[PDB]
Amino acid sequence: VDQPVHNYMVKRIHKRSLSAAFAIASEALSLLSNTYVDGTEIDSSLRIR
Amino acid sequence: NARVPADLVIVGDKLVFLEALERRVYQATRVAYPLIGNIDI
Amino acid sequence: NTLNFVRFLELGLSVACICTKFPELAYVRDGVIQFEVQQPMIARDGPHP
């Protein structure tokens, strides 16, 4: 004679990640830091670029 | 919900999607597409 | 007999080029074109740079 069975199963999570890089050059960093400002009509275009 | 252009096929008695994402994703990048895996014999 | 005159626009080959009129072509020493093409990026993890 048989009896009915109950099953208990437990799973767990698995952790991963994603990575992406983003670089700015030294000249653009010097333009964005508002250091050595001079000739405001010709450096504004470089800053906008 | 939003309306999206995507094809739907019927297999057996189930309505499934059929995506072949190779132009939307993995195009003009530096990564290799999966589902092109290798076998060893 | 009379000839059947061909115009280039009515031909099917006119779809393969962009014709444009330029009168001062004899003075042009060098003419250039420019392209700025960017590419997408996928994001991953693990033992990858």
The DSSP-derived string for B12-40 is TTEEEE----SSSSSSSSSS--SS-----
Two tokens, residue A45: 């275009």
C38 close to B (CB below 8 A): no
For residue C42, what are the contacts with CB-CB under 8 A and spacing of at least 6? B25, B26, B29, B31
Q: Residues of A23-36 as b/e, b for ≥16 C-beta within 10 angstroms?
A: eeeeeeeebeeeee
* 3-state SS assignment for residue A40: coil
Task: Report which of B31, B14, A18, A24 is spatially closest to residue C40, judged by C-alpha positions.
Answer: B31
Which stretch of DSSP H or E encloses residue B10?
Answer: strand B8-11
| Helix, strand or coil, per DSSP, at residue B9 | strand
Measured CA to CA in angstroms, residue B3 lies from B6, B8, B27, C40 at distances of 9, 13, 24, 25
Residue with tokens 């009915």: A4
Specify the residue for token string 């960093």: A29
The answer to whether the Cβ–Cβ distance between A20 and C43 falls below 8 Å is: yes
Structural resolution in Å? 3.7
Q: Which residues of B touch C40 (CB under 8 A)?
A: 27-29
Q: Is C5 helix (H, G, I), strand (E, B) or coil?
A: coil
Interface mutation vs chain C, best among A17, A22, A49, most C CBs within 10 Å:
A17
Inter-chain contact C42–B31, Cβ cutoff 8 Å?
A: yes
Give dist(CA C11, CA C17) in Å, integer.
12
